[PDB]
Amino acid sequence: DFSKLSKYVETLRVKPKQSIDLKKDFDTDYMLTKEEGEELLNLGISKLSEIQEKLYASGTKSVLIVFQAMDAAGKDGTVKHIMTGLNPQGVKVTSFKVPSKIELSHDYLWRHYVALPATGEIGIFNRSHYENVLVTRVHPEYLLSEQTSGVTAIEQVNQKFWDKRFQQINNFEQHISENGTIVLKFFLHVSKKEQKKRFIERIELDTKNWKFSTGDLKERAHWKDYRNAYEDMLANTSTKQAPWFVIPADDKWFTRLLIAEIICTELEKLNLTFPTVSLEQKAELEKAKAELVAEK
């Protein structure tokens, strides 16, 4: 069961006042066996599905879950594994890609605001608004195609620009959080060494190499720039109301376990329950059964 897991999970939450060194302080691989994790993961997925059903039936809340990671951290597989357990009618996964021409004619939050979950729904942001302080920070020339960014030469970008953005993001998440949205953000943290192992494995297998983009190496070459961006992001946009969690990503079964456990534990704070049947509704059910029974 969950005895020690419960305490370890709490260490993964980024506290608001905390400073962040991903190299030193957050292990990309870490208590239980893999066999035990797999069975515990299957309970977590079943509980999450019961929570989803209660949320959908009478929740006064919506749920927004964010995933961000470096390439080959296992994001896509984690998202998939979570979905397989859940009902499609109350859960929507939006995978955010390079902005379209229309999206670039709007502020960088617009396409995310558009996709927010409705009351009783779980929205999964597979990549998110945080892209606007990650890939665009490493590659500030993308800011030049953003008609709304106010950036005409990359020389203009400095720490005040990112600070301003952290303030906008926090104000956005605070607003939706004050209007019924439970927001959970996950950073899947893969080591450089494990990323290389996975890249090479994908290059060598005909079942995956048709899918491999050699562009991923170019982003790996910016590892330190990405690390700086993640650290600054985590240090400034984790709040008690909208927390970040840093999840070790080098063992995939453990990644998934941790995320399922954290989502269940956080949503259990809502004290959701299934609707109950009043005496009046009980009489109606019984009258319906009597009618079926009386049928010619």
Ligand X SMILES: Nc1ncnc2c1ncn2[C@@H]1O[C@H](COP(=O)(O)OP(=O)(O)O)[C@@H](O)[C@H]1O
- Residues in contact with ligand X by CB under 6 A are 76, 95-99, 126-127, 131-132, 135-136, 142
Element (H, E) at 62: strand 62-69
Q: Report the distance separating Cα 156 and Cα 83, nearest Å.
A: 41
| CA gap 259, 85 in Å, rounded | 14
- Looking at the Cβ atoms of 205 and 277, the one nearer to ligand X is 205
The total number of residues written for the chain in this structure: 296
DSSP designation for 100 = P
Distance between CA atoms of residues 152 and 164, nearest Å = 17
For the purposes of burial, counting CB atoms within 10 Å of the CB of 133, is it exposed (0-12), middle (13-18) or buried (19 or more)? buried
Nearer Cβ to ligand X (8/96): 96
Name the minimum Å distance from CB 105 to ligand X.
Answer: 14
Of 125, 119, 126, whose CA–CA distance to 59 is shortest? 119
Of the candidates 175, 153, 194, the one whose C-alpha atom is nearest the C-alpha of residue 241 is: 175
Of all residues in this chain, which one has the CB nearest to ligand X in the complex? 131
Which is closer to ligand X, CB of 100 or CB of 241? 100
CB of 111 to ligand X, least distance (A): 8
Distance set, CA 81 to CA 54, 217, 256, 259 (Å): 20, 26, 8, 11
CB 69, min distance to ligand X, A: 8
Q: Which is nearer to ligand X, 134 or 260 (CB)?
A: 134
Pick between residue 52 and residue 195 the one whose CB is nearest to ligand X. 195
Q: Which is nearer to ligand X, 103 or 231 (CB)?
A: 103
Smallest distance from the beta carbon of 67 to ligand X, in angstroms?
9
Residue with tokens 């070790």: 248
CB of 230 to ligand X, least distance (A): 13
Torsions phi, psi for 247 (to 5 deg): -110, 125
What letter does residue 156 receive in the DSSP assignment?
A: G
Query: Least distance to ligand X from the beta carbon of 218, Å?
Result: 10
